[PDB]
Amino acid sequence: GEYKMMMARVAALPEDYQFVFKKIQNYMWNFSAGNGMDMLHIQYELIDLFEAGAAEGRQVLDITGEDVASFADELVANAKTYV
């Protein structure tokens, strides 16, 4: 269903987008308090953003900045306000 489909979309992205996504997914599972569904909704939003960026031809680290932990950290923090 939804999770498998969303992971398939990640697998269709360039390898660097894939690695960075995996880094963020792990960071969120490592550090997220809060509802697992919120964390998944945020990851789905992130896959929409990553798909668009790859489609426009941007590099993944333009999106996240070099400090991926700080990106993910601000994503798990704005998880509350957003989801």
Side-chain angles (χ1 to χ4, degrees), residues 1-3 5-14 16-31 33-79:
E2 194 175 32
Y3 184 76
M5 185 253 249
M6 291 285 179
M7 297 307 101
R9 292 171 44 174
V10 172
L13 301 170
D16 56 7
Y17 272 85
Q18 296 184 47
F19 186 72
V20 172
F21 181 81
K22 179 172 77 165
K23 284 177 56 166
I24 294 174
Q25 186 173 46
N26 280 285
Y27 181 99
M28 291 184 49
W29 282 335
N30 284 343
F31 291 96
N35 193 301
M37 294 312 286
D38 295 345
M39 296 308 265
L40 283 166
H41 289 145
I42 296 157
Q43 293 172 9
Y44 302 165
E45 293 290 1
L46 183 73
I47 291 161
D48 274 345
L49 183 77
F50 277 19
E51 280 192 343
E56 293 286 340
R58 305 289 301 270
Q59 293 287 333
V60 70
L61 295 179
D62 293 4
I63 307 182
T64 63
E66 282 190 345
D67 189 352
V68 175
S70 169
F71 181 76
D73 192 54
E74 201 182 339
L75 210 55
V76 319
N78 304 190

Coordinates of all heavy atoms in Angstrom, one line a residue, unseen atoms left out:
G1 N 0.9 -1.2 0.0 CA 0.0 0.0 0.0 C 0.9 1.2 0.0 O 1.9 1.2 -0.7
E2 N 0.5 2.2 0.8 CA 1.1 3.5 0.9 C 2.6 3.4 1.2 O 3.4 4.1 0.5 CB 0.4 4.4 1.9 CG 0.8 5.9 1.7 CD 0.0 6.8 2.7 OE1 -0.4 6.4 3.8 OE2 -0.2 8.0 2.2
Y3 N 3.0 2.7 2.2 CA 4.4 2.7 2.6 C 5.3 2.1 1.4 O 6.3 2.7 1.1 CB 4.7 2.0 3.9 CG 6.1 2.0 4.3 CD1 6.7 3.1 4.9 CD2 7.0 0.9 4.2 CE1 8.0 3.2 5.3 CE2 8.3 0.9 4.6 CZ 8.8 2.1 5.2 OH 10.1 2.2 5.6
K4 N 4.8 1.0 0.9 CA 5.7 0.3 -0.2 C 5.8 1.2 -1.4 O 6.8 1.4 -2.0 CB 5.1 -1.0 -0.5 CG 6.1 -2.1 -0.7 CD 5.5 -3.5 -0.8 CE 6.5 -4.6 -0.6
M5 N 4.7 1.9 -1.7 CA 4.6 2.8 -2.9 C 5.5 3.9 -2.7 O 6.2 4.4 -3.6 CB 3.1 3.2 -3.0 CG 2.8 4.1 -4.2 SD 2.5 5.9 -3.7 CE 0.5 5.9 -4.1
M6 N 5.6 4.4 -1.5 CA 6.4 5.6 -1.1 C 7.9 5.2 -1.2 O 8.7 5.9 -1.7 CB 6.0 6.2 0.2 CG 4.6 6.8 0.2 SD 4.6 8.6 -0.7 CE 2.8 9.1 -0.5
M7 N 8.2 4.0 -0.7 CA 9.6 3.5 -0.8 C 10.0 3.2 -2.3 O 11.1 3.5 -2.6 CB 9.8 2.3 0.1 CG 9.6 2.5 1.6 SD 10.6 4.0 2.3 CE 9.0 5.4 2.3
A8 N 9.0 2.8 -3.1 CA 9.3 2.6 -4.5 C 9.7 3.9 -5.2 O 10.5 4.0 -6.1 CB 8.1 2.0 -5.2
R9 N 8.9 5.0 -4.8 CA 9.3 6.3 -5.3 C 10.7 6.8 -4.9 O 11.3 7.5 -5.7 CB 8.2 7.3 -4.9 CG 6.9 7.0 -5.6 CD 5.7 7.7 -5.0 NE 6.0 9.1 -4.8 CZ 5.2 10.1 -4.5 NH1 3.9 9.8 -4.3 NH2 5.6 11.3 -4.3
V10 N 11.1 6.4 -3.7 CA 12.4 6.8 -3.3 C 13.5 6.0 -4.1 O 14.4 6.6 -4.6 CB 12.7 6.4 -1.8 CG1 14.1 6.6 -1.4 CG2 11.8 7.4 -0.9
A11 N 13.2 4.8 -4.4 CA 14.1 3.9 -5.2 C 14.2 4.4 -6.6 O 15.1 4.0 -7.3 CB 13.6 2.5 -5.1
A12 N 13.3 5.3 -7.0 CA 13.3 5.8 -8.4 C 14.1 7.0 -8.5 O 14.5 7.5 -9.5 CB 11.9 6.0 -9.0
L13 N 14.4 7.6 -7.4 CA 15.3 8.8 -7.3 C 16.8 8.5 -7.6 O 17.2 7.3 -7.4 CB 15.2 9.5 -6.0 CG 13.7 9.9 -5.5 CD1 13.8 10.4 -4.1 CD2 13.2 11.0 -6.4
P14 N 17.6 9.5 -7.9 CA 19.0 9.2 -8.1 C 19.6 8.7 -6.8 O 19.0 9.0 -5.7 CB 19.5 10.6 -8.5 CG 18.3 11.4 -9.1 CD 17.2 10.9 -8.3
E15 N 20.7 8.0 -6.9 CA 21.3 7.3 -5.7 C 21.6 8.3 -4.6 O 21.4 8.0 -3.4 CB 22.6 6.5 -6.2
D16 N 22.1 9.5 -4.9 CA 22.4 10.4 -3.8 C 21.2 10.9 -3.1 O 21.2 11.0 -1.8 CB 23.3 11.6 -4.3 CG 22.7 12.4 -5.4 OD1 21.6 12.2 -5.9 OD2 23.5 13.3 -5.9
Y17 N 20.1 11.1 -3.8 CA 18.8 11.3 -3.1 C 18.3 10.2 -2.3 O 17.8 10.4 -1.2 CB 17.7 11.6 -4.2 CG 17.6 13.0 -4.6 CD1 18.4 13.6 -5.7 CD2 16.6 13.9 -4.1 CE1 18.2 14.9 -6.1 CE2 16.5 15.3 -4.5 CZ 17.3 15.7 -5.5 OH 17.2 17.0 -5.9
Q18 N 18.6 9.0 -2.7 CA 18.2 7.8 -2.0 C 19.0 7.7 -0.7 O 18.4 7.4 0.4 CB 18.5 6.5 -2.8 CG 17.5 6.4 -4.0 CD 17.7 5.1 -4.7 OE1 17.7 4.1 -4.1 NE2 17.9 5.2 -6.0
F19 N 20.3 8.0 -0.7 CA 21.2 7.9 0.5 C 20.8 8.9 1.5 O 20.6 8.6 2.7 CB 22.6 8.0 0.1 CG 23.6 7.7 1.2 CD1 23.7 6.4 1.7 CD2 24.3 8.7 1.9 CE1 24.6 6.1 2.7 CE2 25.1 8.4 2.9 CZ 25.3 7.1 3.4
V20 N 20.5 10.1 1.1 CA 20.1 11.2 1.9 C 18.7 10.9 2.6 O 18.6 11.2 3.7 CB 20.2 12.5 1.2 CG1 19.6 13.6 2.1 CG2 21.7 12.8 0.9
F21 N 17.8 10.5 1.8 CA 16.5 10.0 2.3 C 16.7 9.0 3.4 O 16.0 9.1 4.4 CB 15.6 9.5 1.2 CG 14.2 9.1 1.8 CD1 13.3 10.0 2.0 CD2 14.0 7.8 2.2 CE1 12.1 9.7 2.6 CE2 12.8 7.4 2.8 CZ 11.9 8.4 3.0
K22 N 17.5 8.0 3.2 CA 17.8 6.9 4.2 C 18.4 7.5 5.4 O 18.0 7.1 6.6 CB 18.7 5.9 3.6 CG 19.1 4.8 4.5 CD 19.9 3.7 3.8 CE 21.3 4.1 3.6 NZ 22.0 2.8 3.3
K23 N 19.3 8.5 5.3 CA 19.9 9.2 6.4 C 18.8 9.8 7.3 O 18.7 9.7 8.5 CB 21.0 10.1 6.0 CG 22.3 9.5 5.6 CD 23.3 10.6 5.0 CE 23.6 11.7 6.0 NZ 24.9 12.5 5.7
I24 N 17.9 10.6 6.7 CA 16.8 11.3 7.3 C 15.8 10.4 8.0 O 15.3 10.6 9.1 CB 16.1 12.1 6.3 CG1 17.1 13.2 5.8 CG2 14.9 12.8 6.9 CD1 16.5 14.1 4.7
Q25 N 15.4 9.3 7.2 CA 14.5 8.3 7.8 C 15.1 7.7 9.1 O 14.5 7.6 10.1 CB 14.3 7.2 6.8 CG 13.2 6.2 7.2 CD 12.9 5.3 6.0 OE1 13.8 4.8 5.3 NE2 11.6 5.1 5.8
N26 N 16.4 7.3 9.0 CA 17.0 6.8 10.2 C 17.1 7.8 11.3 O 16.9 7.5 12.5 CB 18.4 6.2 9.9 CG 18.3 4.8 9.3 OD1 18.0 3.8 10.0 ND2 18.5 4.7 8.0
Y27 N 17.5 9.1 11.0 CA 17.6 10.1 12.0 C 16.3 10.3 12.8 O 16.2 10.3 14.0 CB 18.0 11.4 11.4 CG 18.2 12.5 12.4 CD1 19.5 12.8 12.9 CD2 17.1 13.2 12.9 CE1 19.6 13.8 13.9 CE2 17.3 14.2 13.9 CZ 18.6 14.5 14.3 OH 18.8 15.5 15.3
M28 N 15.2 10.3 12.0 CA 13.8 10.5 12.6 C 13.4 9.3 13.5 O 12.9 9.5 14.5 CB 12.8 10.7 11.4 CG 13.1 12.0 10.8 SD 11.8 12.4 9.4 CE 10.2 12.0 10.4
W29 N 13.8 8.1 13.1 CA 13.5 6.9 13.9 C 14.4 6.9 15.1 O 14.0 6.4 16.2 CB 13.8 5.7 13.1 CG 12.7 5.3 12.1 CD1 11.4 5.6 12.1 CD2 12.9 4.5 10.9 NE1 10.7 5.0 11.1 CE2 11.6 4.3 10.3 CE3 14.0 3.9 10.3 CZ2 11.4 3.6 9.1 CZ3 13.8 3.1 9.1 CH2 12.5 3.0 8.6
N30 N 15.6 7.4 15.0 CA 16.5 7.5 16.1 C 16.1 8.6 17.1 O 16.3 8.3 18.3 CB 17.9 7.9 15.6 CG 18.7 6.7 14.9 OD1 18.3 5.6 15.1 ND2 19.7 7.0 14.2
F31 N 15.6 9.7 16.6 CA 15.3 10.8 17.5 C 13.9 11.2 17.7 O 13.6 12.0 18.6 CB 16.1 12.0 17.1 CG 17.6 11.9 17.2 CD1 18.4 11.4 16.1 CD2 18.2 12.2 18.4 CE1 19.8 11.3 16.3 CE2 19.6 12.0 18.5 CZ 20.4 11.6 17.4
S32 N 13.0 10.8 16.9 CA 11.6 11.2 17.0 C 11.0 10.7 18.2 O 11.0 9.5 18.4 CB 10.7 10.8 15.8
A33 N 10.5 11.6 19.0 CA 9.4 11.3 19.9 C 8.1 11.5 19.1 O 8.2 11.8 17.9
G34 N 7.0 11.2 19.6 CA 5.8 11.4 18.9 C 5.4 10.3 18.0 O 6.2 9.3 17.7
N35 N 4.2 10.5 17.4 CA 3.5 9.4 16.8 C 4.2 9.0 15.5 O 4.7 9.8 14.7 CB 2.1 10.0 16.5 CG 1.1 9.0 16.1 OD1 1.3 8.2 15.1 ND2 0.0 9.0 16.8
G36 N 4.3 7.7 15.4 CA 4.9 7.1 14.2 C 4.2 7.5 12.9 O 4.9 7.7 11.9
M37 N 2.9 7.7 12.9 CA 2.1 8.2 11.7 C 2.5 9.6 11.3 O 2.6 9.9 10.1 CB 0.6 8.2 11.9 CG 0.1 6.8 12.1 SD 0.8 5.6 10.6 CE -0.4 6.4 9.2
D38 N 2.8 10.5 12.3 CA 3.3 11.9 12.0 C 4.6 11.8 11.3 O 4.9 12.6 10.3 CB 3.4 12.7 13.3 CG 2.1 12.9 14.0 OD1 1.0 12.8 13.4 OD2 2.2 13.3 15.1
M39 N 5.5 11.0 11.8 CA 6.8 10.8 11.2 C 6.7 10.3 9.8 O 7.4 10.8 8.9 CB 7.8 9.9 12.1 CG 8.1 10.6 13.4 SD 8.8 12.4 13.5 CE 10.6 12.1 13.5
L40 N 5.8 9.4 9.5 CA 5.6 8.8 8.2 C 5.0 9.9 7.3 O 5.4 10.1 6.1 CB 4.6 7.6 8.2 CG 5.3 6.3 8.6 CD1 4.2 5.3 8.9 CD2 6.3 5.8 7.6
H41 N 4.0 10.7 7.8 CA 3.4 11.7 6.9 C 4.5 12.8 6.5 O 4.6 13.2 5.4 CB 2.2 12.4 7.6 CG 1.0 11.5 7.7 ND1 0.1 11.4 8.7 CD2 0.6 10.6 6.8 CE1 -0.8 10.5 8.4 NE2 -0.5 10.0 7.3
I42 N 5.4 13.1 7.4 CA 6.5 14.0 7.2 C 7.4 13.4 6.1 O 7.9 14.1 5.2 CB 7.3 14.4 8.4 CG1 6.5 15.1 9.5 CG2 8.5 15.3 8.1 CD1 7.0 14.9 10.9
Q43 N 7.7 12.2 6.2 CA 8.6 11.5 5.2 C 7.9 11.5 3.8 O 8.6 11.6 2.8 CB 8.9 10.1 5.6 CG 9.8 10.1 6.8 CD 10.0 8.7 7.4 OE1 9.6 7.7 6.8 NE2 10.6 8.6 8.6
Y44 N 6.6 11.3 3.8 CA 5.9 11.4 2.5 C 6.0 12.8 1.9 O 6.2 12.9 0.7 CB 4.4 10.9 2.6 CG 4.3 9.4 3.2 CD1 3.1 9.0 3.6 CD2 5.4 8.6 3.2 CE1 2.9 7.7 4.1 CE2 5.3 7.3 3.7 CZ 4.0 6.8 4.2 OH 3.9 5.5 4.7
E45 N 5.8 13.8 2.7 CA 6.0 15.2 2.2 C 7.4 15.4 1.7 O 7.6 16.0 0.7 CB 5.6 16.2 3.3 CG 4.2 16.2 3.7 CD 3.2 16.8 2.7 OE1 3.7 17.2 1.5 OE2 2.0 16.9 3.0
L46 N 8.3 14.8 2.4 CA 9.7 14.9 2.0 C 10.0 14.2 0.7 O 10.8 14.7 -0.2 CB 10.7 14.4 3.1 CG 12.2 14.6 2.8 CD1 12.5 16.0 2.9 CD2 12.9 13.7 3.7
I47 N 9.3 13.1 0.4 CA 9.4 12.4 -0.9 C 8.8 13.2 -2.0 O 9.4 13.3 -3.1 CB 8.8 11.0 -0.8 CG1 9.6 10.1 0.1 CG2 8.6 10.4 -2.2 CD1 8.8 8.9 0.7
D48 N 7.7 13.9 -1.8 CA 7.2 14.8 -2.7 C 8.2 15.9 -3.1 O 8.4 16.3 -4.2 CB 5.9 15.5 -2.3 CG 4.6 14.7 -2.6 OD1 4.7 13.8 -3.4 OD2 3.6 15.0 -2.0
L49 N 8.8 16.5 -2.0 CA 9.8 17.5 -2.2 C 11.0 17.0 -3.0 O 11.5 17.7 -3.9 CB 10.2 18.1 -0.9 CG 11.1 19.3 -0.8 CD1 10.4 20.5 -1.2 CD2 11.8 19.4 0.5
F50 N 11.6 15.9 -2.6 CA 12.7 15.3 -3.2 C 12.4 14.9 -4.7 O 13.2 15.1 -5.6 CB 13.2 14.0 -2.5 CG 14.1 14.3 -1.3 CD1 14.2 15.6 -0.8 CD2 14.9 13.3 -0.8 CE1 15.1 15.8 0.3 CE2 15.8 13.5 0.2 CZ 15.9 14.7 0.8
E51 N 11.2 14.4 -5.0 CA 10.8 14.1 -6.4 C 10.8 15.3 -7.2 O 11.2 15.2 -8.4 CB 9.4 13.4 -6.5 CG 9.4 12.0 -6.2 CD 8.1 11.3 -6.7 OE1 7.1 12.0 -6.9 OE2 8.2 10.0 -6.8
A52 N 10.2 16.4 -6.7 CA 10.2 17.6 -7.5 C 11.6 18.1 -7.7 O 11.9 18.5 -8.8 CB 9.3 18.7 -6.7
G53 N 12.4 18.2 -6.7 CA 13.7 18.7 -6.8 C 14.5 17.9 -7.8 O 15.2 18.5 -8.7
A54 N 14.4 16.6 -7.8 CA 15.1 15.7 -8.8 C 14.6 16.0 -10.2 O 15.3 16.1 -11.1 CB 15.0 14.3 -8.4
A55 N 13.3 16.1 -10.3 CA 12.7 16.5 -11.6 C 13.1 17.8 -12.1 O 13.2 18.0 -13.3 CB 11.1 16.4 -11.5
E56 N 13.4 18.8 -11.3 CA 13.9 20.1 -11.7 C 15.4 20.1 -12.0 O 15.9 21.0 -12.5 CB 13.6 21.2 -10.6 CG 12.1 21.5 -10.4 CD 11.5 22.3 -11.5 OE1 12.2 23.0 -12.2 OE2 10.2 22.2 -11.5
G57 N 16.1 19.0 -11.5 CA 17.5 18.9 -11.8 C 18.4 19.4 -10.7 O 19.6 19.6 -10.9
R58 N 17.8 19.6 -9.5 CA 18.6 20.1 -8.4 C 19.3 18.9 -7.7 O 18.9 17.8 -7.7 CB 17.8 20.8 -7.3 CG 17.0 21.9 -7.8 CD 17.9 23.1 -8.2 NE 18.7 23.6 -7.1 CZ 18.3 24.6 -6.3 NH1 17.1 25.2 -6.4 NH2 19.1 25.0 -5.4
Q59 N 20.4 19.3 -7.0 CA 21.1 18.3 -6.2 C 20.5 18.2 -4.8 O 20.1 19.2 -4.3 CB 22.6 18.7 -6.2 CG 23.4 18.6 -7.5 CD 23.6 17.2 -8.0 OE1 23.8 16.3 -7.2 NE2 23.7 17.0 -9.3
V60 N 20.5 16.9 -4.3 CA 19.8 16.7 -3.0 C 20.3 17.6 -1.9 O 19.6 18.2 -1.1 CB 19.8 15.2 -2.6 CG1 21.1 14.7 -2.2 CG2 18.7 15.1 -1.4
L61 N 21.7 17.9 -1.8 CA 22.2 18.7 -0.8 C 21.9 20.2 -0.9 O 22.1 20.9 0.1 CB 23.7 18.5 -0.6 CG 24.1 17.0 -0.1 CD1 25.6 17.0 0.0 CD2 23.4 16.5 1.2
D62 N 21.4 20.6 -2.0 CA 20.8 22.0 -2.2 C 19.5 22.0 -1.3 O 19.1 23.1 -0.8 CB 20.4 22.3 -3.6 CG 21.6 22.4 -4.6 OD1 22.7 22.2 -4.2 OD2 21.4 22.8 -5.8
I63 N 18.8 20.9 -1.3 CA 17.6 20.9 -0.5 C 17.8 20.8 1.0 O 17.3 21.6 1.7 CB 16.7 19.7 -1.0 CG1 16.5 19.7 -2.5 CG2 15.3 19.6 -0.2 CD1 15.7 18.7 -3.1
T64 N 18.7 19.9 1.4 CA 18.9 19.6 2.8 C 20.0 20.5 3.5 O 19.9 20.7 4.7 CB 19.3 18.2 3.1 OG1 20.5 17.9 2.4 CG2 18.2 17.2 2.5
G65 N 20.9 21.1 2.7 CA 22.1 21.6 3.2 C 23.0 20.4 3.5 O 22.6 19.3 3.5
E66 N 24.2 20.7 3.8 CA 25.2 19.7 4.0 C 25.0 19.0 5.4 O 25.3 17.8 5.5 CB 26.7 20.3 4.0 CG 27.1 20.5 2.5 CD 28.5 20.8 2.3 OE1 29.2 21.1 3.3 OE2 29.0 20.7 1.1
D67 N 24.5 19.7 6.3 CA 24.2 19.2 7.6 C 22.8 18.5 7.6 O 21.8 19.2 8.0 CB 24.3 20.3 8.7 CG 24.2 19.7 10.1 OD1 23.9 18.5 10.2 OD2 24.4 20.5 11.1
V68 N 22.7 17.3 7.2 CA 21.5 16.5 7.1 C 20.8 16.3 8.5 O 19.6 16.3 8.6 CB 21.7 15.2 6.3 CG1 20.4 14.3 6.3 CG2 22.2 15.5 5.0
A69 N 21.6 16.1 9.5 CA 21.1 15.9 10.9 C 20.3 17.2 11.3 O 19.2 17.1 11.8 CB 22.1 15.6 11.9
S70 N 20.8 18.4 11.0 CA 20.1 19.6 11.3 C 18.9 19.8 10.5 O 17.9 20.3 11.0 CB 21.1 20.8 11.2 OG 20.4 21.9 11.3
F71 N 18.9 19.4 9.2 CA 17.7 19.3 8.4 C 16.6 18.4 9.0 O 15.5 18.8 9.2 CB 18.0 18.9 7.0 CG 16.9 18.8 6.1 CD1 16.4 20.0 5.5 CD2 16.2 17.6 5.8 CE1 15.3 20.0 4.7 CE2 15.1 17.6 4.9 CZ 14.6 18.8 4.4
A72 N 17.0 17.2 9.3 CA 16.1 16.2 9.8 C 15.6 16.6 11.2 O 14.4 16.5 11.5 CB 16.7 14.8 9.9
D73 N 16.4 17.3 11.9 CA 16.1 17.7 13.3 C 15.0 18.8 13.2 O 14.1 18.8 13.9 CB 17.4 18.2 14.0 CG 17.2 18.4 15.4 OD1 16.8 17.5 16.1 OD2 17.5 19.5 15.9
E74 N 15.2 19.7 12.2 CA 14.2 20.7 12.0 C 12.9 20.2 11.4 O 11.9 20.8 11.4 CB 14.8 21.8 11.1 CG 14.0 23.2 11.3 CD 14.6 24.2 10.4 OE1 15.8 24.1 9.9 OE2 13.9 25.2 10.1
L75 N 13.0 19.1 10.7 CA 11.8 18.4 10.2 C 11.1 17.7 11.3 O 9.9 17.8 11.4 CB 12.4 17.4 9.1 CG 11.5 17.1 7.9 CD1 11.0 18.2 7.1 CD2 12.4 16.1 7.0
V76 N 11.8 17.0 12.2 CA 11.1 16.4 13.3 C 10.6 17.4 14.3 O 9.7 17.1 15.0 CB 12.0 15.3 14.2 CG1 12.8 14.4 13.3 CG2 12.9 16.0 15.3
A77 N 11.1 18.6 14.3 CA 10.6 19.7 15.2 C 9.4 20.3 14.6 O 8.4 20.5 15.3 CB 11.7 20.7 15.4
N78 N 9.4 20.7 13.3 CA 8.3 21.2 12.6 C 7.3 20.1 12.3 O 6.2 20.4 11.7 CB 8.7 22.0 11.3 CG 9.8 23.1 11.6 OD1 10.1 23.8 10.7 ND2 10.3 23.1 12.8
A79 N 7.6 18.9 12.6 CA 6.6 17.8 12.5 C 5.3 18.2 13.3 O 4.2 18.1 12.7
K80 N 5.5 18.6 14.5 CA 4.4 19.1 15.4 C 3.5 20.1 14.7 O 2.3 19.9 14.6 CB 5.0 19.7 16.7
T81 N 4.1 21.3 14.3 CA 3.3 22.3 13.7 C 2.7 21.9 12.3 O 1.5 22.2 12.1 CB 4.2 23.6 13.4
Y82 N 3.4 21.0 11.5 CA 2.9 20.6 10.2 C 1.8 19.5 10.2 O 0.7 19.7 9.7 CB 4.1 20.3 9.3
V83 N 2.2 18.3 10.7 CA 1.3 17.1 10.7 C 0.3 17.1 11.8 O 0.6 16.6 12.9 CB 2.1 15.8 10.6

